Amino acid sequence: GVEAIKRGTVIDHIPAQIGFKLLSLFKLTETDQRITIGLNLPSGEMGRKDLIKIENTFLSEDQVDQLALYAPQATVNRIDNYEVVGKSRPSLPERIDNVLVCPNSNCISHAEPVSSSFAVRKRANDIALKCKYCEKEFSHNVVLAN
């Protein structure tokens, strides 16, 4: 596509203006081998599409379903020998630990040395996240706002 690799992952169908967020959010910059980023690529059905290619790397257990919460229709293509060895589409997990910040000012998660952790319920219109410590439940819009 816009580049090829012997082995690596290719995250395609990334929504626009989110592509650049993933290089920071997964720190795909602490790397030595090549990355190909194509931004605002046409995708006839979804117009704007960003796409990332990482040579020699495959996304870990975390990032794949953490990607579910960030680019719900992205398609992760595992490649080896230039063959699409696996294709994946992320599922929403039961929980997301470490990466999200509790919106509640008075949650102890903000003062003490502990990893944040939220439960993921896929609540009719949107994902609701319940914080493991203060027990409040929030719209994912709120929890992963920018």
Partner: protein, 310 residues
Amino acid sequence: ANPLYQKHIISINDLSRDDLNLVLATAAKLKANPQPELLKHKVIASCFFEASTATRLSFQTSMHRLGASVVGFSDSANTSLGKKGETLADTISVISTYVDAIVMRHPQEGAARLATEFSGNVPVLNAGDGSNQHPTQTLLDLFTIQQTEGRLDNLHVAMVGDLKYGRTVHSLTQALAKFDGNRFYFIAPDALAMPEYILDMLDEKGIAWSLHSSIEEVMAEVDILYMTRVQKERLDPSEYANVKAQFVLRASDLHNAKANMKVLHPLPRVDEIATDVDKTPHAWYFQQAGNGIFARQALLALVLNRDLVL
């Protein structure tokens, strides 16, 4: 081993209908036949990082009626957390090497859950964390409703006041949704309404609830009228319009209440219950406070004793 032995009592959410029923059955037994030695030689820490009179003194009287020992604080201004920057994680890590259970009240929501990550083998019992939960308030209110109503199912329960910051009603509603057929009436000013996650749960469960702008609307319908206090200390400045009680209960308004009906209140009360109510047969709030001794004795008895023969 009984189901509650060494459990952490953190949230009503983690307890089932039978854990709850086990506490009430035990509280009833110890209310009738006392056990002065049940916890002979256990030392229990009472750590109150936020103001309390009734939760702290009912808890340490319960410990003393069962032969236990108490060490602790009611004011974190003099701990090494207060003056030297000890984290709550290192505070709990150290205190768990000394004692057999930790009773904790703290101002940030989530504090007792955090304590359990550091606690080790020591059970942590939540005397209130910010505006989240107050599990031991619900075991004394459920013992009181049972005492007066002889039933914990099919009741008409009205909850009045600051329902957004009230940890007592967040825990009580979650517990009464475990029994069958309870009808809830929530009367609160908009700003201080029931948080949506409690409502979502009532609905997902098929429980009936409704909102009302007055108490008169529901006075003849209710079995329990649960009054709460505006949590001034938890309010945001934008909520300061809501500091004064919006719904005040006076003896006059008890005009056509069912005879069995009781007015419960976790206390302290500010202006929401006039003192003339105190002299009516409906006022049950100081008998309720008294029941804290049996509900808390029960919980301490069950968490630290494998099998209990009572």
